[PDB]
Amino acid sequence: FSVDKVRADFPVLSREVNGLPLAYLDSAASAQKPSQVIDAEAEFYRHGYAAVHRGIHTLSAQATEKMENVRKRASLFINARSAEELVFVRGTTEGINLVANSWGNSNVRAGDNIIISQMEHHANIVPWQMLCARVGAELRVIPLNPDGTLQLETLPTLFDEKTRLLAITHVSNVLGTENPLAEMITLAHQHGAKVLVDGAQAVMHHPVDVQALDCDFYVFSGHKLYGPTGIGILYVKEALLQEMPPWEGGGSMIATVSLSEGTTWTKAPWRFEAGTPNTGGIIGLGAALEYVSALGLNNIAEYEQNLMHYALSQLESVPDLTLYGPQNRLGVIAFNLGKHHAYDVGSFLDNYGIAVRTGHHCAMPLMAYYNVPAMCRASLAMYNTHEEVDRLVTGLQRIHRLLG
Amino acid sequence: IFSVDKVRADFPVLSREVNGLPLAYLDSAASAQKPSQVIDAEAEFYRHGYAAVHRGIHTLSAQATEKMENVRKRASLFINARSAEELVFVRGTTEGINLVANSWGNSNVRAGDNIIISQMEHHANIVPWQMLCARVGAELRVIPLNPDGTLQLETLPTLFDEKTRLLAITHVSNVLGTENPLAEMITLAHQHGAKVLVDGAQAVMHHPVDVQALDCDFYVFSGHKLYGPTGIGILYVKEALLQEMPPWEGGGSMIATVSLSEGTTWTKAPWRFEAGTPNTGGIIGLGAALEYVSALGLNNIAEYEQNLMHYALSQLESVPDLTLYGPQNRLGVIAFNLGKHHAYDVGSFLDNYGIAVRTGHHCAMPLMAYYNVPAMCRASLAMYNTHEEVDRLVTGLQRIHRLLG
Ligand SMILES: *Cc1c(COP(=O)(O)O)cnc(C)c1O
Ligand SMILES: *Cc1c(COP(=O)(O)O)cnc(C)c1O
């Protein structure tokens, strides 16, 4: 693995901000893309473009086949049994909503309950709140620990015969905590409950196998995978997916449509894809998967882990620095500097050409647990370097010196 | 004024050869080709500009956010909405219609009520209302067709009553190219206190669209037919209605506050309806597309496309056993069948000649049912299409007629 050869593929790293070389630590919010993905999408638009859905002419057919090929590649990437177990979505959020409506409405009833965790992204919180509101069920929460880990021993208590679903995050977008999915899924299934996994922060860090996890639902976003915006993947166990009613109605998800005799649906995954999909994004996603797969995920894991160790090692020399989350954390470092407002810190770091994210990070309960209005977050991705970490450290030190 | 060559110079796919022959792409009605400006806009954004939106503290994020909202503004001006806050970013027409069908429909349509659609509707403007009607136990009423491809307008007064909440109608047919008399329908619709949703997916690239003039309550369209990128579209909703609509998808960025005890509250519209990371590249590209189309001018495009249509319809009279569907004043598309031949065979043979047309039911089955055919061939004539290509189509059809009898 060579971070230089990798950095050579990303033009954004050449960008300047406030007159200085960009150091982009915000990858957790969205990932930068290599020229391959961008050029893949662009070239598709330039020499390849037509409509999908098995049009009679050549460009359309080839486009359709490309789309299905990407579906296959995606399926192989997360190691699903069949590509028919994967659905194209706008992203993690839509996927979760789709499950929450399609599967949730038929499988969750009055008096039942769903389980989430206190570290969840809003995407993995609100759709279940909406659901519970619809059918009159209860939303139960797995509580945290001060070190940023969930309390596993509470699960036997949270689960009962009325528990249909466990919605859990693979990796925290704030803390970088990786939850013990295997244990949770094993325990969850014993009570006859399905498990949905939010992997939006997972899939780019290391290999993900959904057969090994035995998770019932799995969702993730492409734009954090160094792919284009507006595309994501929903994996669902075939047995469950085939029995799920459609969510969005429209063209291409129907078998037949009649204004007298009614309407029938085609098979999944296609049952859940209505109207024209996002083709360019799918192509770009394919490219992204190719690129990451070509670098290899264990290499990325190794480099990112060593980089993380370096960063955490260096950040110890920063006075009045408060870190949130465990030592085994993936991809992100959440911190606060003294009593300073997070946005001021962020602004100062921005002035120094360093991009970090501030605010509640779309997890309010997580912030509520730590009794803070917000946190600073630095992401260390595969193209990030020691020099940038040094810039971050020195920056924090300078802020501390200057603002006391 | 308008030069198809100067315009054609901007679209690289038109330089392509297909099955060894120069491409004639008549499938624009399915999806439109993009000029270099759009493609390069999205690409350059990705290359030198890219970050997450939603008011991140650093520079790229802020700039990205403003770019997004600027595109929203440009779109509102493009369709002449009062406010940019009346516009919602969607995956395309289908998601827009579904969003309305769920969000607005569930609260505004009840047992015993009824919705009106037409027989020429795209499935996108059919199925979600079926779903709604099934959910709340309402009735779906249909405006019947005429053999010439026009709706029977005289039937409307009877179809409307005090129980009619919504008219979901298409601006322009994706098959026939029929342009419906929206103003009349909306007047009549409003007289009964009913809302109107307009499917504009086939409209917005042909001529100017003014939603204030139309006074339509909902308007939807797709970006990829407007010569923009895939996976992006616009939902226009009257502010008064939009402000009272509950959220559909839950998640980040559409919330004010989130609590696991005190519950959850929503931010203002339109943002209430945009959950998670939007499609930023698509939005940028969409902005570029709107700029390009506006720069050419819509009336110019309308005139040129009209002359092209007249030419095509004139030339197609010399094709034996050619059956056309729809009126003479049609916009943008020509739906046809050749003798007793299967549409897909015709399409394939035309594909062999380097000509791209579409076949099948075109996602309107009832329309096909009305004409007693399983499918139709459809040729699209867009702003970058030429007389040369029409000549090629005619000669192609004639050759197919020679060969297949
Ligand atoms: C294309 C089209 C639709 C569907 O648009 P999508 O982009 O696929 O969502 C709906 N109605 C009409 C009339 C159309 O032409
Ligand atoms: C980004 C993220 C989401 C939301 O994904 P979107 O692409 O915005 O739809 C959900 N959960 C986690 C953990 C995330 O990091």
mmCIF file of N, CA, C and O in Angstrom, chain B residues 201-259:
data_model
loop_
_atom_site.group_PDB
_atom_site.id
_atom_site.type_symbol
_atom_site.label_atom_id
_atom_site.label_comp_id
_atom_site.label_asym_id
_atom_site.label_seq_id
_atom_site.Cartn_x
_atom_site.Cartn_y
_atom_site.Cartn_z
ATOM 1 N N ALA B 201 -43.282 15.566 -16.997
ATOM 2 C CA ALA B 201 -42.046 14.896 -17.386
ATOM 3 C C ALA B 201 -41.741 15.025 -18.882
ATOM 4 O O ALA B 201 -40.580 15.053 -19.271
ATOM 5 N N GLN B 202 -42.778 15.062 -19.712
ATOM 6 C CA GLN B 202 -42.611 15.221 -21.161
ATOM 7 C C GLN B 202 -42.818 16.646 -21.678
ATOM 8 O O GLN B 202 -42.800 16.875 -22.882
ATOM 9 N N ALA B 203 -43.031 17.588 -20.768
ATOM 10 C CA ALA B 203 -43.386 18.961 -21.115
ATOM 11 C C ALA B 203 -42.176 19.900 -21.118
ATOM 12 O O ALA B 203 -41.881 20.560 -22.113
ATOM 13 N N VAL B 204 -41.523 19.981 -19.966
ATOM 14 C CA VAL B 204 -40.564 21.040 -19.640
ATOM 15 C C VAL B 204 -39.405 21.290 -20.623
ATOM 16 O O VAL B 204 -38.826 22.379 -20.609
ATOM 17 N N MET B 205 -39.026 20.301 -21.428
ATOM 18 C CA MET B 205 -37.968 20.512 -22.422
ATOM 19 C C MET B 205 -38.484 21.048 -23.766
ATOM 20 O O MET B 205 -37.700 21.515 -24.588
ATOM 21 N N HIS B 206 -39.784 20.945 -24.010
ATOM 22 C CA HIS B 206 -40.363 21.373 -25.289
ATOM 23 C C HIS B 206 -40.700 22.861 -25.390
ATOM 24 O O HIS B 206 -40.505 23.471 -26.441
ATOM 25 N N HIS B 207 -41.247 23.431 -24.320
ATOM 26 C CA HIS B 207 -41.611 24.842 -24.322
ATOM 27 C C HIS B 207 -41.638 25.400 -22.891
ATOM 28 O O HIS B 207 -41.442 24.650 -21.937
ATOM 29 N N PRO B 208 -41.882 26.718 -22.736
ATOM 30 C CA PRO B 208 -41.927 27.317 -21.396
ATOM 31 C C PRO B 208 -43.081 26.800 -20.536
ATOM 32 O O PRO B 208 -44.182 26.578 -21.048
ATOM 33 N N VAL B 209 -42.819 26.633 -19.240
ATOM 34 C CA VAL B 209 -43.821 26.172 -18.287
ATOM 35 C C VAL B 209 -43.930 27.170 -17.138
ATOM 36 O O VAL B 209 -42.948 27.447 -16.449
ATOM 37 N N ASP B 210 -45.136 27.696 -16.943
ATOM 38 C CA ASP B 210 -45.414 28.674 -15.896
ATOM 39 C C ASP B 210 -46.466 28.089 -14.965
ATOM 40 O O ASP B 210 -47.628 27.966 -15.336
ATOM 41 N N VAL B 211 -46.070 27.748 -13.746
ATOM 42 C CA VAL B 211 -46.988 27.082 -12.831
ATOM 43 C C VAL B 211 -47.930 28.076 -12.164
ATOM 44 O O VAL B 211 -49.006 27.706 -11.693
ATOM 45 N N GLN B 212 -47.541 29.345 -12.150
ATOM 46 C CA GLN B 212 -48.403 30.386 -11.615
ATOM 47 C C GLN B 212 -49.528 30.660 -12.596
ATOM 48 O O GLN B 212 -50.663 30.915 -12.202
ATOM 49 N N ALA B 213 -49.206 30.609 -13.882
ATOM 50 C CA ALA B 213 -50.216 30.782 -14.912
ATOM 51 C C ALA B 213 -51.157 29.585 -14.909
ATOM 52 O O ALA B 213 -52.376 29.743 -14.987
ATOM 53 N N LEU B 214 -50.586 28.388 -14.792
ATOM 54 C CA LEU B 214 -51.377 27.166 -14.738
ATOM 55 C C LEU B 214 -52.181 27.080 -13.444
ATOM 56 O O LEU B 214 -53.262 26.494 -13.419
ATOM 57 N N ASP B 215 -51.642 27.653 -12.370
ATOM 58 C CA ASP B 215 -52.279 27.593 -11.056
ATOM 59 C C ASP B 215 -52.444 26.146 -10.590
ATOM 60 O O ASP B 215 -53.312 25.839 -9.777
ATOM 61 N N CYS B 216 -51.598 25.262 -11.104
ATOM 62 C CA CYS B 216 -51.591 23.869 -10.678
ATOM 63 C C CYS B 216 -51.062 23.743 -9.252
ATOM 64 O O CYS B 216 -50.189 24.500 -8.834
ATOM 65 N N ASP B 217 -51.617 22.798 -8.499
ATOM 66 C CA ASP B 217 -51.255 22.619 -7.095
ATOM 67 C C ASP B 217 -49.964 21.830 -6.917
ATOM 68 O O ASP B 217 -49.155 22.156 -6.042
ATOM 69 N N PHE B 218 -49.797 20.773 -7.706
ATOM 70 C CA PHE B 218 -48.528 20.052 -7.742
ATOM 71 C C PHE B 218 -47.989 19.972 -9.166
ATOM 72 O O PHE B 218 -48.760 19.833 -10.118
ATOM 73 N N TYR B 219 -46.670 20.048 -9.318
ATOM 74 C CA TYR B 219 -46.046 19.854 -10.625
ATOM 75 C C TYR B 219 -44.778 19.029 -10.455
ATOM 76 O O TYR B 219 -43.955 19.342 -9.597
ATOM 77 N N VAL B 220 -44.627 17.966 -11.241
ATOM 78 C CA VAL B 220 -43.414 17.142 -11.145
ATOM 79 C C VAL B 220 -42.672 16.988 -12.468
ATOM 80 O O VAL B 220 -43.295 16.928 -13.528
ATOM 81 N N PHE B 221 -41.340 16.940 -12.414
ATOM 82 C CA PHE B 221 -40.593 16.542 -13.615
ATOM 83 C C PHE B 221 -39.196 15.979 -13.336
ATOM 84 O O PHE B 221 -38.635 16.164 -12.249
ATOM 85 N N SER B 222 -38.666 15.274 -14.336
ATOM 86 C CA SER B 222 -37.379 14.588 -14.238
ATOM 87 C C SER B 222 -36.257 15.343 -14.945
ATOM 88 O O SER B 222 -36.460 15.950 -15.994
ATOM 89 N N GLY B 223 -35.061 15.270 -14.376
ATOM 90 C CA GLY B 223 -33.922 15.994 -14.905
ATOM 91 C C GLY B 223 -33.255 15.327 -16.094
ATOM 92 O O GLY B 223 -32.642 16.001 -16.924
ATOM 93 N N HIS B 224 -33.354 14.004 -16.174
ATOM 94 C CA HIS B 224 -32.624 13.269 -17.195
ATOM 95 C C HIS B 224 -33.277 13.386 -18.569
ATOM 96 O O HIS B 224 -32.641 13.100 -19.585
ATOM 97 N N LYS B 225 -34.534 13.815 -18.601
ATOM 98 C CA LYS B 225 -35.203 14.112 -19.864
ATOM 99 C C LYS B 225 -35.016 15.572 -20.267
ATOM 100 O O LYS B 225 -35.301 15.960 -21.398
ATOM 101 N N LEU B 226 -34.533 16.368 -19.324
ATOM 102 C CA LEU B 226 -34.262 17.787 -19.534
ATOM 103 C C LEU B 226 -32.798 17.991 -19.935
ATOM 104 O O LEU B 226 -32.246 19.079 -19.768
ATOM 105 N N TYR B 227 -32.153 16.900 -20.344
ATOM 106 C CA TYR B 227 -30.739 16.876 -20.722
ATOM 107 C C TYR B 227 -29.834 17.057 -19.518
ATOM 108 O O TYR B 227 -28.698 17.512 -19.651
ATOM 109 N N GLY B 228 -30.341 16.671 -18.351
ATOM 110 C CA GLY B 228 -29.558 16.659 -17.130
ATOM 111 C C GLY B 228 -29.176 15.248 -16.727
ATOM 112 O O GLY B 228 -29.459 14.302 -17.447
ATOM 113 N N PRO B 229 -28.531 15.099 -15.564
ATOM 114 C CA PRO B 229 -28.103 13.791 -15.055
ATOM 115 C C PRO B 229 -29.255 12.946 -14.529
ATOM 116 O O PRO B 229 -30.357 13.449 -14.312
ATOM 117 N N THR B 230 -29.002 11.655 -14.363
ATOM 118 C CA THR B 230 -29.983 10.757 -13.779
ATOM 119 C C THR B 230 -30.070 10.937 -12.266
ATOM 120 O O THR B 230 -29.159 11.469 -11.640
ATOM 121 N N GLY B 231 -31.183 10.498 -11.690
ATOM 122 C CA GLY B 231 -31.331 10.442 -10.249
ATOM 123 C C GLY B 231 -31.649 11.775 -9.603
ATOM 124 O O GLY B 231 -31.436 11.955 -8.404
ATOM 125 N N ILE B 232 -32.174 12.708 -10.388
ATOM 126 C CA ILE B 232 -32.555 14.010 -9.860
ATOM 127 C C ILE B 232 -33.791 14.531 -10.591
ATOM 128 O O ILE B 232 -33.935 14.366 -11.805
ATOM 129 N N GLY B 233 -34.683 15.156 -9.834
ATOM 130 C CA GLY B 233 -35.916 15.679 -10.381
ATOM 131 C C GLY B 233 -36.501 16.714 -9.450
ATOM 132 O O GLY B 233 -36.008 16.891 -8.332
ATOM 133 N N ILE B 234 -37.551 17.390 -9.910
ATOM 134 C CA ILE B 234 -38.165 18.470 -9.142
ATOM 135 C C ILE B 234 -39.628 18.200 -8.854
ATOM 136 O O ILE B 234 -40.392 17.766 -9.741
ATOM 137 N N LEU B 235 -39.990 18.449 -7.596
ATOM 138 C CA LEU B 235 -41.382 18.487 -7.160
ATOM 139 C C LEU B 235 -41.777 19.897 -6.710
ATOM 140 O O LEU B 235 -41.318 20.377 -5.671
ATOM 141 N N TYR B 236 -42.633 20.541 -7.500
ATOM 142 C CA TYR B 236 -43.233 21.817 -7.134
ATOM 143 C C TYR B 236 -44.571 21.618 -6.452
ATOM 144 O O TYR B 236 -45.433 20.895 -6.951
ATOM 145 N N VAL B 237 -44.737 22.282 -5.317
ATOM 146 C CA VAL B 237 -45.974 22.230 -4.555
ATOM 147 C C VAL B 237 -46.317 23.627 -4.075
ATOM 148 O O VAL B 237 -45.444 24.338 -3.580
ATOM 149 N N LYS B 238 -47.582 24.013 -4.203
ATOM 150 C CA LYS B 238 -48.037 25.292 -3.671
ATOM 151 C C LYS B 238 -47.671 25.404 -2.195
ATOM 152 O O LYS B 238 -47.929 24.489 -1.409
ATOM 153 N N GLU B 239 -47.057 26.527 -1.839
ATOM 154 C CA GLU B 239 -46.544 26.758 -0.491
ATOM 155 C C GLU B 239 -47.587 26.466 0.586
ATOM 156 O O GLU B 239 -47.299 25.783 1.574
ATOM 157 N N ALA B 240 -48.789 26.997 0.392
ATOM 158 C CA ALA B 240 -49.886 26.816 1.337
ATOM 159 C C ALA B 240 -50.154 25.338 1.625
ATOM 160 O O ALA B 240 -50.464 24.966 2.758
ATOM 161 N N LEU B 241 -50.059 24.505 0.594
ATOM 162 C CA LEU B 241 -50.278 23.071 0.752
ATOM 163 C C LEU B 241 -49.042 22.407 1.340
ATOM 164 O O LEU B 241 -49.141 21.541 2.206
ATOM 165 N N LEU B 242 -47.878 22.823 0.859
ATOM 166 C CA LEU B 242 -46.620 22.225 1.277
ATOM 167 C C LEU B 242 -46.390 22.433 2.772
ATOM 168 O O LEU B 242 -45.876 21.542 3.452
ATOM 169 N N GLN B 243 -46.762 23.603 3.283
ATOM 170 C CA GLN B 243 -46.551 23.900 4.697
ATOM 171 C C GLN B 243 -47.353 22.994 5.630
ATOM 172 O O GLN B 243 -46.966 22.798 6.780
ATOM 173 N N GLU B 244 -48.462 22.449 5.140
ATOM 174 C CA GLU B 244 -49.311 21.580 5.950
ATOM 175 C C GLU B 244 -49.035 20.086 5.738
ATOM 176 O O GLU B 244 -49.642 19.244 6.399
ATOM 177 N N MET B 245 -48.127 19.750 4.828
ATOM 178 C CA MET B 245 -47.842 18.344 4.525
ATOM 179 C C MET B 245 -46.879 17.716 5.538
ATOM 180 O O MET B 245 -45.816 18.278 5.817
ATOM 181 N N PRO B 246 -47.245 16.547 6.099
ATOM 182 C CA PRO B 246 -46.322 15.878 7.024
ATOM 183 C C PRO B 246 -45.140 15.241 6.302
ATOM 184 O O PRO B 246 -45.229 14.993 5.101
ATOM 185 N N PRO B 247 -44.046 14.966 7.024
ATOM 186 C CA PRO B 247 -42.884 14.352 6.374
ATOM 187 C C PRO B 247 -43.161 12.925 5.919
ATOM 188 O O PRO B 247 -44.055 12.274 6.463
ATOM 189 N N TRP B 248 -42.406 12.462 4.928
ATOM 190 C CA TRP B 248 -42.566 11.118 4.392
ATOM 191 C C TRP B 248 -41.424 10.224 4.866
ATOM 192 O O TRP B 248 -41.611 9.388 5.750
ATOM 193 N N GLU B 249 -40.238 10.420 4.294
ATOM 194 C CA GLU B 249 -39.043 9.735 4.769
ATOM 195 C C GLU B 249 -38.536 10.402 6.038
ATOM 196 O O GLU B 249 -38.465 11.632 6.112
ATOM 197 N N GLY B 250 -38.186 9.591 7.034
ATOM 198 C CA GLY B 250 -37.553 10.093 8.242
ATOM 199 C C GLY B 250 -36.043 9.996 8.140
ATOM 200 O O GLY B 250 -35.518 9.197 7.363
ATOM 201 N N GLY B 251 -35.337 10.799 8.931
ATOM 202 C CA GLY B 251 -33.885 10.752 8.945
ATOM 203 C C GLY B 251 -33.227 12.072 9.290
ATOM 204 O O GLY B 251 -33.859 12.977 9.833
ATOM 205 N N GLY B 252 -31.938 12.171 8.985
ATOM 206 C CA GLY B 252 -31.181 13.372 9.266
ATOM 207 C C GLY B 252 -31.576 14.501 8.342
ATOM 208 O O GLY B 252 -32.175 14.279 7.285
ATOM 209 N N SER B 253 -31.288 15.717 8.796
ATOM 210 C CA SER B 253 -31.394 16.943 8.008
ATOM 211 C C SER B 253 -32.828 17.425 7.789
ATOM 212 O O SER B 253 -33.043 18.603 7.504
ATOM 213 N N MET B 254 -33.803 16.539 7.965
ATOM 214 C CA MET B 254 -35.213 16.915 7.867
ATOM 215 C C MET B 254 -35.836 17.124 9.243
ATOM 216 O O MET B 254 -37.037 17.368 9.357
ATOM 217 N N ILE B 255 -35.018 16.999 10.283
ATOM 218 C CA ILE B 255 -35.479 17.151 11.661
ATOM 219 C C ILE B 255 -35.018 18.466 12.278
ATOM 220 O O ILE B 255 -33.970 19.004 11.920
ATOM 221 N N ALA B 256 -35.829 18.979 13.195
ATOM 222 C CA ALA B 256 -35.433 20.087 14.053
ATOM 223 C C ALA B 256 -34.665 19.534 15.255
ATOM 224 O O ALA B 256 -33.493 19.857 15.463
ATOM 225 N N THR B 257 -35.346 18.712 16.048
ATOM 226 C CA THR B 257 -34.742 18.052 17.203
ATOM 227 C C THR B 257 -35.127 16.573 17.230
ATOM 228 O O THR B 257 -36.219 16.204 16.795
ATOM 229 N N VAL B 258 -34.234 15.741 17.764
ATOM 230 C CA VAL B 258 -34.480 14.302 17.893
ATOM 231 C C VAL B 258 -34.283 13.865 19.343
ATOM 232 O O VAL B 258 -33.219 14.071 19.922
ATOM 233 N N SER B 259 -35.320 13.264 19.919
ATOM 234 C CA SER B 259 -35.262 12.753 21.284
ATOM 235 C C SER B 259 -35.866 11.350 21.356
ATOM 236 O O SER B 259 -36.826 11.046 20.648
#
